Amino acid sequence: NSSASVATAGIGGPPQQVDQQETWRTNFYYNDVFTWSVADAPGSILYTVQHSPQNNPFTAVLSQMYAGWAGGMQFRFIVAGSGVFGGRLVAAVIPPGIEIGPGLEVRQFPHVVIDARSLEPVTITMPDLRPNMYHPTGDPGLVPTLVLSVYNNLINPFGGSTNAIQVTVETRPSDDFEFVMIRAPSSKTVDSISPAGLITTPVLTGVGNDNRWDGQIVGLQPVPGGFSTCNRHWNLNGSTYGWSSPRFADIDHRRGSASYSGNNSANALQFWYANAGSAIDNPISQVAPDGFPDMSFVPFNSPNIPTAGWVGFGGIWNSNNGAPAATTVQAYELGFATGAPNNLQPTTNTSGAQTVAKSIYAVVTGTNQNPTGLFVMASGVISTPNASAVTYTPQPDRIVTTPGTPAAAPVGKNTPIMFASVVRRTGDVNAAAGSTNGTQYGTGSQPLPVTIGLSLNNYSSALMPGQFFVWQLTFASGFMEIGLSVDGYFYAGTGASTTLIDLTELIDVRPVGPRPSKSTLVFNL
Amino acid sequence: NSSASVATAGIGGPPQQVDQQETWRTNFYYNDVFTWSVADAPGSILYTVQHSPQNNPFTAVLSQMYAGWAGGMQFRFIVAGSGVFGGRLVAAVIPPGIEIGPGLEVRQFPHVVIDARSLEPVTITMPDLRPNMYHPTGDPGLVPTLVLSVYNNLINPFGGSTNAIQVTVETRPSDDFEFVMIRAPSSKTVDSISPAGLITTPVLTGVGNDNRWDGQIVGLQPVPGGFSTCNRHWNLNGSTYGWSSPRFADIDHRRGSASYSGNNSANALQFWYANAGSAIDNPISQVAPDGFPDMSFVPFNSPNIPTAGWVGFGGIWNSNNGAPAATTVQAYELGFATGAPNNLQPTTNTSGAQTVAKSIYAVVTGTNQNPTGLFVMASGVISTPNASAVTYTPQPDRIVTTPGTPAAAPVGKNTPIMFASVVRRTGDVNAAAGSTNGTQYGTGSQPLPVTIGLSLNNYSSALMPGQFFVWQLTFASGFMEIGLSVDGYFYAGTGASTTLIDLTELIDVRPVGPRPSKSTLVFNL
Amino acid sequence: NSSASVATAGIGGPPQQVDQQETWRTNFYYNDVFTWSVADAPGSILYTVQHSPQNNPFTAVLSQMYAGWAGGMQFRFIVAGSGVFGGRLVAAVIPPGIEIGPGLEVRQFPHVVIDARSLEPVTITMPDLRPNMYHPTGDPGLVPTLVLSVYNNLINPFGGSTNAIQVTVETRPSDDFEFVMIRAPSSKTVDSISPAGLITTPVLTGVGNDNRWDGQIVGLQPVPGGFSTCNRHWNLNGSTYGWSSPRFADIDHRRGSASYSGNNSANALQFWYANAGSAIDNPISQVAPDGFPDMSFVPFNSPNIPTAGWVGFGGIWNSNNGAPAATTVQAYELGFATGAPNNLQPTTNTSGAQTVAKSIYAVVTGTNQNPTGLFVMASGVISTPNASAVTYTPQPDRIVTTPGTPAAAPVGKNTPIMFASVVRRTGDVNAAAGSTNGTQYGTGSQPLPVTIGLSLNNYSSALMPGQFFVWQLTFASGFMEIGLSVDGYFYAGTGASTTLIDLTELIDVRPVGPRPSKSTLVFNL
């Protein structure tokens, strides 16, 4: 690999200003560590990095201080384990012009080998292979990448009882490394925007809540079979495929049709429905009124209760009138459906759907009119039998989504998870119940604070489509990793387990950074 | 001019560190030739080319092996003369970022004159005008342009038809030219050039098919009125505006209404329809289902057959059970229409339309159902009564388009072309034609391996919106040029022509690389 | 051994007159790796390769540019060890014309030992054994072989499952290696290697389709009983024994007899047949018409449907007039049979057979005519009653073959494979299945771009009848090898397996070049 690049790092002028500083470059300090197991395949990539000053601790804080950089940086690797262990690793410096993934053939680029038995550390100096121009802390332009790959797999002769060893990574800047465009310290560009700050501990401990139910988040729920979600959900492209803005507020739809069933004008069950694409007061999407639940309706016939329906309180409002008609005000079961008045069927897709309401108990005096509005409150309560507390609501089938929505499915051994929260439940009027309030797990895709920050800031040039942004969770007994995708869905490396993970013994959350999607999030509980 | 700069290029070049290949390249190799006539006016530009590793053919093969390039290229010019013809051309090396087109004069540039009376070739070195920045082979950036323009008019002493001579160009890399970043010439796909591979000899010869009727390409059809195409179309930005898959696939639509009109349940024409924009089971877009024809319907009255209709074979398919109805199996006209079920009228706008199907002959027993599905085969036949019929189908007026689709209209003397194929026609019981095939012409806007390849790999930033990518088609006798826009339309230089070009006597196809879109593409057949 | 011959090669080499490329090739590049276990017996041959410009990847790219080659190649071997395992391998440079296979011993050859306890790589030069005759790049002739065989058995001190280690090979061209006859690296097609291009990553990924049902390839199916295929099949000799075109094309047969059996002219099953070997309007061979299925008929009785029948949609077409009959339009079973019109029995021999068609449902009015034509579409559907049905179709017993067609039967542990795809099934009015696709498996013997490419360019004398051309298929987790015989069958190394291999998690495909056919192809998935 090149070495004349240093003369080119060498060129200065008006970026230097006064009084440049070598800073500390002398010794090697801990950047990172990686694990190598007998499990891992030849041609698998254990460690990768683009050349940057964010590869020492000292040059990452100086990055705020300086606006531009140039030159080489040295990477030192220490294999720890034993001299009795077979296997070999390959470290190679790759020039820019590349897309890294399944076709990027590490063992056919100029490279050096690292042997597992090495007692002493092995060093590489990584130069600049495009040294002609200063990089800012904006776009650097395309830079060389350092990749370490397994050439032949780790062997223990004493069997499978011990099966992994670690390799340390240490760095120091080289001689040719320099900085420029100092200015004075402040915050700047792409550096200040990262998905990291969305998730944090106080939100999961007790400050945060879900985006479907406004509940307190008690758990993490794995969903092996996948799911799809859009309403009040957001991505790292800054937009939503939903019809709700990211806050809880009343459901107002001005044009629907209203009727009642029982052939009696007083003491009857109220019905309201409308087709999708008439939400004239909603800017987000005219498909349904903001605040309307993303679930398919649940059939009930009087006096029988809906088994795990969404219920909210409200009543019927005509457009000419300043406030709703009181006689109509009652609890309603709400959902998305097709086939109103009396051929009702649930719908999982918004295209050709109908937004439907029916009162769970009798209204004082009904109303027959068309068109006329529906006015129902911000968050809902769960309708379900008396002492019911089985699994969670909605199940993946129950969630309604648009045809623009991308679905959440497993990637590798990484499984999508939903955030589980405590919801109010009711067993139908009076009687008895399993407890004082009863147990009930309502689930959402996201914590509402993450949803507000995806809507607030655009993170497209801040997490790549192949990556997850990763944080690690610490529990009193055990720890795990959790990931957020660019499509807004959250993942865990739990595989096919369904067990509820308890956030109530949560000590901590902290970022691990960007990781590629296929590679498994840690689960040790 | 800039021939001192040999030593100042030699600071920008050397950080890379690589060998010089001199011994192979003693001789110059053929690049192109152009024609010079008595009617080519002074100020006109006959020939232009950008600096690129693709100018010498052997350097193009070597470009594959390397990820960067730099240094100059020599150009050598031969005038074919006579010695009795007067006139001159001017050769200038144009700076980077100076727009090329007919507005461009050589007037105030450094230049050499190329003389009509010359008998000796005249050799210019084209130096590197970017040398501080090494160029990538697969993302190069901005380069200079070599331009040749007519200073003085070609004049002949005598009469006759004889009015033209040719000027040949051959090239050789200079002693400053260099390849660097060998790495692994291992597993990159588009090292080979992405745009250039779209058209090839055996593909235009007999391997290729067209992307709308699946026929064999016999010819090229100019459309001097211009035209528009959205479906099964891709482009050099990777984007599309269609609904149908990149390959040909069968029609399955689960959600329609079926009915018939008449005085009886039997020996009637079956009708089925569903709305446009409702196909939520199509991954590409909801405009219609996959396999659905992008040409407007043909109204007809029982018992008569539609002409220049798209007909396909299929039947009514039960949505609840998932299974066909045999009695319904018949040939059907499938099309886009508006005014369903019974006020039907034709449109070319998808929005607010209905995708409609009607049988071309009597079904034994019809069915009235809602909902019911439609299941029809992939392949399509043109409906035409006995012998002599319509010139080519679809005509540009028949084609439907969806918002976002740009239309292709002539530029200068370049006119947009469609690809013509021989297609199967059926129409009217025991009909016949004047020929055995019954010579019926189906047209597509692209060849299908091109539609598939432009959907499989990226092509962005390779061709400039002012330029066309050019290939030269070579016949046993004569040649012509064909061009590709950024948009993914093909163009040819026949001007106000409607005449069909016969591709039967094709020997070869070669890439000519980008050329300005106002440059006429030559026609000598 | 033969390392004196440096100066005697230098008379045979020099008449050509060319430069030496040294500066690019400082380092060695990855060629392959193989596995060494406690169960690989002494005398066994683990790895073999012929001298060829295709061993180093960058030399392969350069081979394109040149029409001849000569000189040696260095080979470098790394044992992955541990230091507690005993055993040895022997490395010999084998003379030209000495047959390779398991009968081959290293016993009396010059050799080096490669040691289990080795920690340092061991490097052999493979000299040119042909130097008086310069080799062609695109017709090379006879070369020597490098062979590695087990001298002493791998032994472990301890128990556990741990029983294997790997040995890597990397190569570098020698200082004697040379390229000559640059000419024009211009316009030769198969400069690139003809055999190697047949299988590619995006082709096995999602661009390829199979050559009998036109479906998407999901898997590989081993057939440990062996099988035979003639139609739409080509080979590495360019020869075929089929009737149908290299692409999928519609059935048109002008000369048949049509009849029905029953008690009435209406609501009957139409039957049509013509003899095999009579299709004089088919350019390829008169065995049947173009588009006709190469699987034996399925007898059925009215009113029941055939199972695992080939069904296609079409009708009776008037031979005198050249035009269809609408009333006859229906779904038909098309097949090869013997015993027509009414003693019909199935066969797999074409000679003395009849190509037969029978409708699967009632036609409104039937026709009795002689002669009358048959006109049916290209695409085909599998006939199956409701849900659970046959494992794959065609089964090897159903396939018809014509004289001259060789059958593919296992060799050693390599077994012949068919390519599996998901195909459309229809059968029995308003039927259904357990899944929405109704998971029906269609099989082809080759991928269709391979059938088309093996018909488009020549391939003779590239692969030796004892060897198989090998490609390596690489997955996200594990890898396997696939092989191609001279005959144009594909093979895999699953032995007595019938289990279907799922190609869903494929990352990559790379050519491994020829290997002896008795060599097992590896399976680690």
Side-chain angles (χ1 to χ4, degrees):
Chain A
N1 206 358
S2 301
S3 80
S5 310
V6 318
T8 322
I11 310 170
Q16 290 176 288
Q17 314 192 256
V18 285
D19 294 300
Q20 310 90 62
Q21 296 168 181
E22 196 168 350
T23 64
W24 194 237
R25 314 188 183 168
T26 298
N27 295 107
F28 283 107
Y29 296 115
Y30 170 83
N31 195 12
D32 231 304
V33 72
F34 62 90
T35 189
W36 187 29
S37 172
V38 303
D40 301 300
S44 69
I45 294 177
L46 300 188
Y47 186 78
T48 307
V49 88
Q50 289 187 25
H51 217 214
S52 172
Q54 293 288 312
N55 288 329
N56 309 268
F58 311 83
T59 56
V61 88
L62 289 167
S63 297
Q64 169 150 76
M65 172 179 281
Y66 288 95
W69 56 290
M73 181 181 297
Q74 307 179 6
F75 285 71
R76 191 163 63 158
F77 302 101
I78 314 95
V79 175
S82 177
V84 94
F85 303 143
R88 294 194 301 160
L89 299 181
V90 44
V93 185
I94 310 290
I98 29 65
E99 182 171 298
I100 316 186
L104 184 286
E105 297 301 312
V106 187
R107 309 92 63 257
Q108 284 188 349
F109 285 69
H111 69 263
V112 282
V113 292
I114 287 168
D115 295 78
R117 57 189 184 110
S118 190
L119 193 297
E120 287 168 92
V122 186
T123 311
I124 190 143
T125 293
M126 181 177 184
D128 206 4
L129 290 182
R130 197 228 66 187
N132 54 59
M133 189 162 76
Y134 309 128
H135 294 293
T137 39
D139 192 21
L142 294 173
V143 310
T145 296
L146 187 56
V147 183
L148 208 164
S149 168
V150 184
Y151 212 127
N152 39 274
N153 44 259
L154 178 62
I155 293 153
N156 186 352
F158 289 117
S161 320
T162 279
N163 73 258
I165 58 169
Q166 53 175 184
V167 190
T168 303
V169 193
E170 301 173 329
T171 41
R172 58 176 176 194
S174 213
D175 287 338
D176 53 297
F177 182 77
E178 269 308 308
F179 277 130
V180 289
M181 311 167 212
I182 188 168
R183 92 236 186 284
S186 63
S187 70
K188 42 184 162 76
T189 192
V190 283
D191 180 72
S192 304
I193 289 180
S194 166
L198 308 161
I199 282 283
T200 184
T201 316
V203 176
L204 297 190
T205 48
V207 181
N209 53 269
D210 82 277
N211 65 347
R212 187 140 56 197
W213 309 95
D214 200 33
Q216 291 297 119
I217 303 163
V218 55
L220 301 168
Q221 181 46 49
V223 178
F227 58 105
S228 196
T229 293
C230 55
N231 192 35
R232 211 176 295 107
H233 179 103
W234 256 258
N235 59 48
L236 290 64
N237 312 158
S239 189
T240 188
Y241 290 108
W243 59 90
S244 304
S245 59
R247 43 186 301 241
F248 282 93
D250 308 284
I251 308 189
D252 192 1
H253 203 258
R254 199 66 64 248
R255 301 176 172 155
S257 173
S259 56
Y260 48 85
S261 177
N263 299 299
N264 208 55
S265 288
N267 292 110
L269 291 198
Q270 195 49 57
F271 183 71
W272 183 86
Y273 66 104
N275 301 307
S278 286
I280 56 178
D281 301 295
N282 193 358
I284 317 288
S285 195
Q286 287 200 318
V287 308
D290 174 288
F292 200 77
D294 46 289
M295 293 165 44
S296 69
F297 96 119
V298 178
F300 65 113
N301 281 106
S302 171
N304 304 273
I305 196 193
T307 298
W310 189 115
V311 150
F313 212 67
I316 301 289
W317 179 18
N318 177 293
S319 179
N320 294 291
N321 300 359
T327 34
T328 71
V329 167
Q330 195 36 271
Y332 285 87
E333 190 271 356
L334 269 77
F336 274 98
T338 45
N342 294 326
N343 280 104
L344 292 186
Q345 171 167 218
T347 190
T348 318
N349 202 266
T350 53
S351 173
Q354 298 191 317
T355 56
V356 57
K358 155 170 180 184
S359 74
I360 46 167
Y361 300 121
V363 296
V364 177
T365 300
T367 186
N368 198 92
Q369 208 163 59
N370 179 30
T372 200
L374 185 58
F375 191 58
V376 180
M377 294 165 182
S379 183
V381 307
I382 288 177
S383 190
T384 187
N386 294 65
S388 200
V390 190
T391 65
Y392 48 87
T393 296
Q395 289 292 291
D397 302 69
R398 188 70 71 85
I399 320 168
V400 177
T401 201
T402 62
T405 309
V411 187
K413 309 166 63 63
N414 304 301
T415 297
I417 72 180
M418 290 202 266
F419 280 92
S421 64
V422 199
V423 179
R424 167 167 187 252
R425 66 83 253 168
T426 175
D428 186 57
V429 68
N430 291 308
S435 205
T436 322
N437 292 330
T439 300
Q440 205 66 191
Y441 300 111
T443 54
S445 55
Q446 304 179 316
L448 182 53
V450 186
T451 304
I452 296 165
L454 297 180
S455 210
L456 197 66
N457 314 92
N458 174 10
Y459 293 108
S460 291
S461 297
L463 200 65
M464 310 194 179
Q467 288 172 342
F468 297 159
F469 192 106
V470 188
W471 298 256
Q472 204 219 116
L473 307 169
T474 295
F475 301 111
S477 192
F479 63 109
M480 88 195 281
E481 283 167 337
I482 187 180
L484 177 56
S485 62
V486 292
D487 277 341
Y489 299 99
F490 281 90
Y491 281 81
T494 47
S497 192
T498 57
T499 303
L500 184 56
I501 302 178
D502 198 359
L503 298 167
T504 318
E505 54 166 290
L506 190 56
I507 290 172
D508 174 275
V509 196
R510 62 188 47 211
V512 176
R515 308 292 201 196
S517 58
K518 286 170 270 195
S519 303
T520 314
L521 307 165
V522 171
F523 183 88
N524 271 257
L525 257 69
Chain B
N1 168 61
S2 303
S3 294
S5 299
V6 198
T8 38
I11 46 155
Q16 312 309 116
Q17 302 171 275
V18 79
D19 64 285
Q20 173 47 240
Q21 306 191 39
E22 177 182 90
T23 320
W24 78 277
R25 54 151 177 107
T26 49
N27 285 87
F28 294 75
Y29 290 106
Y30 165 78
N31 173 272
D32 262 305
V33 46
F34 64 103
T35 298
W36 186 11
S37 74
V38 314
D40 299 303
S44 298
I45 318 184
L46 294 157
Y47 167 89
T48 62
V49 58
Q50 307 165 325
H51 200 257
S52 179
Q54 302 302 135
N55 295 331
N56 196 281
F58 296 89
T59 62
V61 193
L62 284 163
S63 191
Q64 306 180 128
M65 184 150 88
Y66 283 85
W69 57 289
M73 191 78 36
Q74 313 174 314
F75 289 93
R76 180 153 70 184
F77 289 110
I78 309 84
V79 183
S82 60
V84 300
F85 302 142
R88 300 213 297 176
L89 319 157
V90 284
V93 164
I94 312 311
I98 310 291
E99 197 197 6
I100 189 67
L104 197 64
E105 304 199 302
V106 167
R107 167 186 311 266
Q108 68 316 295
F109 292 134
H111 63 268
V112 161
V113 301
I114 300 299
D115 200 288
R117 294 171 71 190
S118 55
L119 54 68
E120 190 191 45
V122 192
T123 312
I124 197 153
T125 297
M126 195 188 180
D128 195 354
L129 301 178
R130 309 299 291 175
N132 295 30
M133 285 174 187
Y134 229 93
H135 282 272
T137 52
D139 288 301
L142 179 55
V143 289
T145 308
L146 181 56
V147 169
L148 179 286
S149 184
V150 183
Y151 205 3
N152 294 124
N153 176 257
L154 188 72
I155 194 67
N156 182 339
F158 300 111
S161 62
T162 299
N163 66 113
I165 62 172
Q166 309 186 318
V167 177
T168 295
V169 66
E170 71 186 340
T171 196
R172 169 170 179 273
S174 75
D175 295 310
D176 319 286
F177 174 79
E178 44 187 53
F179 283 130
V180 81
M181 309 316 167
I182 194 157
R183 73 304 89 126
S186 339
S187 282
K188 176 169 281 199
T189 294
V190 288
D191 52 355
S192 309
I193 308 303
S194 216
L198 288 170
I199 314 198
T200 53
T201 308
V203 157
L204 216 71
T205 302
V207 173
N209 61 331
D210 85 96
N211 66 337
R212 186 147 54 201
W213 289 106
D214 201 15
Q216 313 305 144
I217 311 186
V218 297
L220 307 170
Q221 174 58 67
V223 183
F227 68 91
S228 202
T229 313
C230 78
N231 189 36
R232 204 167 303 130
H233 213 255
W234 271 260
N235 83 358
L236 276 63
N237 307 290
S239 193
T240 186
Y241 315 100
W243 63 80
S244 289
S245 284
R247 75 163 183 130
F248 298 102
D250 49 275
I251 307 152
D252 50 286
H253 209 75
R254 194 177 289 277
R255 289 166 299 259
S257 176
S259 57
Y260 58 65
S261 186
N263 57 56
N264 204 279
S265 61
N267 303 271
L269 308 189
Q270 187 55 78
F271 177 72
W272 180 97
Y273 73 99
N275 289 254
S278 61
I280 60 184
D281 307 291
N282 179 324
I284 293 171
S285 192
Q286 309 82 67
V287 182
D290 193 17
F292 203 77
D294 52 294
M295 56 195 78
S296 63
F297 107 121
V298 175
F300 70 100
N301 309 302
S302 190
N304 288 286
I305 63 106
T307 191
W310 192 98
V311 157
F313 282 62
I316 310 305
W317 188 87
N318 191 285
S319 320
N320 208 34
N321 304 132
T327 48
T328 69
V329 173
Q330 183 45 269
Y332 286 68
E333 201 258 346
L334 264 59
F336 255 95
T338 27
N342 308 138
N343 292 83
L344 295 161
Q345 179 177 347
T347 185
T348 51
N349 192 17
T350 58
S351 272
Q354 292 88 71
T355 42
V356 298
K358 186 168 159 192
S359 307
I360 54 150
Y361 300 117
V363 297
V364 62
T365 42
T367 170
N368 180 236
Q369 203 157 319
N370 191 4
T372 202
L374 183 88
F375 258 65
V376 177
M377 277 179 159
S379 311
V381 292
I382 296 173
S383 184
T384 40
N386 200 102
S388 282
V390 67
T391 49
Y392 80 65
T393 298
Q395 285 291 292
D397 47 287
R398 291 294 306 284
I399 303 169
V400 318
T401 42
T402 41
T405 309
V411 174
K413 199 170 203 197
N414 302 311
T415 194
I417 63 156
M418 299 178 181
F419 293 86
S421 48
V422 185
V423 174
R424 175 63 57 198
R425 40 171 294 168
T426 189
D428 192 60
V429 187
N430 311 319
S435 43
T436 301
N437 49 25
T439 317
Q440 196 76 65
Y441 285 101
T443 57
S445 293
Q446 302 189 339
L448 196 80
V450 184
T451 297
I452 288 168
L454 287 166
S455 193
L456 197 61
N457 310 104
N458 177 291
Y459 279 84
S460 301
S461 82
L463 182 58
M464 297 166 59
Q467 286 146 70
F468 286 156
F469 202 104
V470 188
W471 281 259
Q472 197 192 286
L473 314 173
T474 323
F475 283 77
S477 191
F479 57 106
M480 59 171 281
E481 286 166 1
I482 185 165
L484 176 56
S485 61
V486 202
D487 291 316
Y489 288 101
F490 295 86
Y491 290 76
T494 59
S497 195
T498 196
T499 306
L500 180 84
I501 297 151
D502 161 49
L503 297 161
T504 292
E505 311 200 67
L506 176 72
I507 62 189
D508 203 47
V509 182
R510 63 174 279 238
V512 169
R515 295 297 194 202
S517 54
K518 287 169 174 62
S519 309
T520 304
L521 296 148
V522 306
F523 188 97
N524 293 125
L525 302 165
Chain C
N1 168 61
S2 303
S3 294
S5 299
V6 198
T8 38
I11 46 155
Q16 312 309 116
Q17 302 171 275
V18 79
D19 64 285
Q20 173 47 240
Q21 306 191 39
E22 177 182 90
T23 320
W24 78 277
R25 54 151 177 107
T26 49
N27 285 87
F28 294 75
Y29 290 106
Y30 165 78
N31 173 272
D32 262 305
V33 46
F34 64 103
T35 298
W36 186 11
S37 74
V38 314
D40 299 303
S44 298
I45 318 184
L46 294 157
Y47 167 89
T48 62
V49 58
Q50 307 165 325
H51 200 257
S52 179
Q54 302 302 135
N55 295 331
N56 196 281
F58 296 89
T59 62
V61 193
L62 284 163
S63 191
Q64 306 180 128
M65 184 150 88
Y66 283 85
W69 57 289
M73 191 78 36
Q74 313 174 314
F75 289 93
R76 180 153 70 184
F77 289 110
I78 309 84
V79 183
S82 60
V84 300
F85 302 142
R88 300 213 297 176
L89 319 157
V90 284
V93 164
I94 312 311
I98 310 291
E99 197 197 6
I100 189 67
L104 197 64
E105 304 199 302
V106 167
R107 167 186 311 266
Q108 68 316 295
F109 292 134
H111 63 268
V112 161
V113 301
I114 300 299
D115 200 288
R117 294 171 71 190
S118 55
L119 54 68
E120 190 191 45
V122 192
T123 312
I124 197 153
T125 297
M126 195 188 180
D128 195 354
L129 301 178
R130 309 299 291 175
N132 295 30
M133 285 174 187
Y134 229 93
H135 282 272
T137 52
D139 288 301
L142 179 55
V143 289
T145 308
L146 181 56
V147 169
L148 179 286
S149 184
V150 183
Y151 205 3
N152 294 124
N153 176 257
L154 188 72
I155 194 67
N156 182 339
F158 300 111
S161 62
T162 299
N163 66 113
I165 62 172
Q166 309 186 318
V167 177
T168 295
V169 66
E170 71 186 340
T171 196
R172 169 170 179 273
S174 75
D175 295 310
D176 319 286
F177 174 79
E178 44 187 53
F179 283 130
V180 81
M181 309 316 167
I182 194 157
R183 73 304 89 126
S186 339
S187 282
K188 176 169 281 199
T189 294
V190 288
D191 52 355
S192 309
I193 308 303
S194 216
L198 288 170
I199 314 198
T200 53
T201 308
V203 157
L204 216 71
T205 302
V207 173
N209 61 331
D210 85 96
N211 66 337
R212 186 147 54 201
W213 289 106
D214 201 15
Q216 313 305 144
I217 311 186
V218 297
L220 307 170
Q221 174 58 67
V223 183
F227 68 91
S228 202
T229 313
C230 78
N231 189 36
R232 204 167 303 130
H233 213 255
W234 271 260
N235 83 358
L236 276 63
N237 307 290
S239 193
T240 186
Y241 315 100
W243 63 80
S244 289
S245 284
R247 75 163 183 130
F248 298 102
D250 49 275
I251 307 152
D252 50 286
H253 209 75
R254 194 177 289 277
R255 289 166 299 259
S257 176
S259 57
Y260 58 65
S261 186
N263 57 56
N264 204 279
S265 61
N267 303 271
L269 308 189
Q270 187 55 78
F271 177 72
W272 180 97
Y273 73 99
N275 289 254
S278 61
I280 60 184
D281 307 291
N282 179 324
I284 293 171
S285 192
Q286 309 82 67
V287 182
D290 193 17
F292 203 77
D294 52 294
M295 56 195 78
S296 63
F297 107 121
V298 175
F300 70 100
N301 309 302
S302 190
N304 288 286
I305 63 106
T307 191
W310 192 98
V311 157
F313 282 62
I316 310 305
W317 188 87
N318 191 285
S319 320
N320 208 34
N321 304 132
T327 48
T328 69
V329 173
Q330 183 45 269
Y332 286 68
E333 201 258 346
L334 264 59
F336 255 95
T338 27
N342 308 138
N343 292 83
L344 295 161
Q345 179 177 347
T347 185
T348 51
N349 192 17
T350 58
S351 272
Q354 292 88 71
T355 42
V356 298
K358 186 168 159 192
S359 307
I360 54 150
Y361 300 117
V363 297
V364 62
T365 42
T367 170
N368 180 236
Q369 203 157 319
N370 191 4
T372 202
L374 183 88
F375 258 65
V376 177
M377 277 179 159
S379 311
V381 292
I382 296 173
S383 184
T384 40
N386 200 102
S388 282
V390 67
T391 49
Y392 80 65
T393 298
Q395 285 291 292
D397 47 287
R398 291 294 306 284
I399 303 169
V400 318
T401 42
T402 41
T405 309
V411 174
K413 199 170 203 197
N414 302 311
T415 194
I417 63 156
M418 299 178 181
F419 293 86
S421 48
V422 185
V423 174
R424 175 63 57 198
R425 40 171 294 168
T426 189
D428 192 60
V429 187
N430 311 319
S435 43
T436 301
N437 49 25
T439 317
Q440 196 76 65
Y441 285 101
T443 57
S445 293
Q446 302 189 339
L448 196 80
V450 184
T451 297
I452 288 168
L454 287 166
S455 193
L456 197 61
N457 310 104
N458 177 291
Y459 279 84
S460 301
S461 82
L463 182 58
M464 297 166 59
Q467 286 146 70
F468 286 156
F469 202 104
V470 188
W471 281 259
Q472 197 192 286
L473 314 173
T474 323
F475 283 77
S477 191
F479 57 106
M480 59 171 281
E481 286 166 1
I482 185 165
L484 176 56
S485 61
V486 202
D487 291 316
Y489 288 101
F490 295 86
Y491 290 76
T494 59
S497 195
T498 196
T499 306
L500 180 84
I501 297 151
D502 161 49
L503 297 161
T504 292
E505 311 200 67
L506 176 72
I507 62 189
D508 203 47
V509 182
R510 63 174 279 238
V512 169
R515 295 297 194 202
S517 54
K518 287 169 174 62
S519 309
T520 304
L521 296 148
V522 306
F523 188 97
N524 293 125
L525 302 165

